[PDB]
Design a protein around this ligand. Structure first.
Ligand SMILES: COc1ccc([C@H]2CNC(=O)C2)cc1OC1CCCC1
Ligand SMILES: [Mg+2]
Ligand SMILES: [Zn+2]
Length: 323
């Protein structure tokens, strides 16, 4: 109550604690943070989005995340949205994005895992699920989250974009699709290689502010930004990181139990009888998270040096828990 307002004082910081905001908002973290973010940035006024309309959409979207899924519930969406809100303010990216691109990136973060069933694209494909038949095995979940999110906008009592122009709605839809499809982990290596080429030919104004000429370059940075926000758990304080680790392992091990029940091969990091939680996090940091943030740090230096220091410290803690 007064605790919620104290926690939200850190709305614009990496140290914000989304678990605390959840506790004080009737477990509506996503509705809560999305509303705090939009007010802070004056987006409701800029795009003449009604408050009732915005709240009804957000509450419906949030009720569409599954509360019995350990990691991919509404708290993860809320976290990715809050993280993207901070990354958009990085000094190196100052005045680089339009208001429509800022709106799109934050909206993408919010809907980006909606209706997640708690199993991976590969699981959905090997069990011949209806979702995989629908999407022909390509970015199964991601196409689905986009579909639900944009579906809910089709209803007057819920169209938060009704006061944008047709032209603006089209551009936003293109940008959002692009950004959510980029959260598909099987696209990670591709995305990182492209981000490394963008750093290679990085250009800044006289005062260290990125120069982004075309739409192409702007959406490439936005794509990568949402993807970093998705893979930001290890760059947060150790206390936060460990609760996120606990949740993803719970979810991955539940998938492993379903794999065993059906006589399918068990995905090794989903096998609770053999997988080391600690080794898996160190591997995840060394091979995926660090390589990504090291590159993001290059693009916006020295803005993300503390984020990298926290990461390297967290990496060493998981390492020390391994005998
Ligand atoms: C907190 O950790 C993790 C946080 C987030 C993810 C995303 C990528 N895959 C997912 O399904 C979501 C994986 C994590 O750890 C997994 C890889 C290493 C062990 C588990
Ligand atoms: Mg996802
Ligand atoms: Zn996600």
């Amino acid at each position: 109550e007064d605790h919620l307002a104290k926690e939200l004082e850190d709305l614009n910081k990496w140290g914000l604690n989304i678990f605390n905001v959840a506790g004080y908002s009737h477990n509506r973290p996503l509705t809560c943070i999305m509303y705090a973010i939009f007010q802070e940035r004056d987006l409701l006024k800029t795009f003449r989005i009604s408050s009732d309309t915005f709240i009804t959409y957000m509450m419906t979207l949030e009720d569409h995340y599954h509360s019995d899924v350990a990691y991919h519930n509404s708290l993860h969406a809320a976290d990715v949205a809050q993280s993207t809100h901070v990354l958009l303010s990085t000094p190196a990216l100052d005045a680089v994005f339009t208001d429509l691109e800022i709106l799109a990136a934050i909206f993408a973060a919010a809907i980006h895992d909606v209706d997640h069933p708690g199993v991976s694209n590969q699981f959905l494909i090997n069990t011949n699920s209806e979702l995989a038949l629908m999407y022909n095995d390509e970015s199964v979940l991601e196409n689905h989250h986009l579909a639900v999110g944009f579906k809910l906008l089709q209803e007057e009592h819920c169209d938060i974009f009704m006061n944008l122009t047709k032209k603006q709605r089209q551009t936003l839809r293109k940008m959002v699709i692009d950004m959510v499809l980029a959260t598909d982990m099987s696209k990670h290596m591709s995305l990182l290689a492209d981000l490394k080429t963008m750093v290679e030919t990085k250009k800044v104004t006289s005062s260290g502010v990125l120069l982004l000429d075309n739409y192409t370059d702007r959406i490439q940075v936005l794509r990568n930004m949402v993807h970093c926000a998705d893979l930001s758990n290890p760059t947060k304080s150790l206390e936060l990181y460990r609760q996120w680790t606990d949740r993803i392992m719970e979810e991955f091990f539940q998938q492993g139990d379903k794999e065993r029940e059906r006589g399918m091969e068990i995905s090794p990091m989903c096998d609770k009888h053999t997988a080391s939680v600690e080794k898996s996090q160190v591997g995840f940091i060394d091979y995926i998270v660090h390589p990504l943030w090291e590159t993001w740090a290059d693009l916006v230096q020295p803005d993300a040096q503390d984020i990298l220091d926290t990461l390297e410290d967290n990496r060493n803690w998981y390492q020390s828990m391994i005998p």
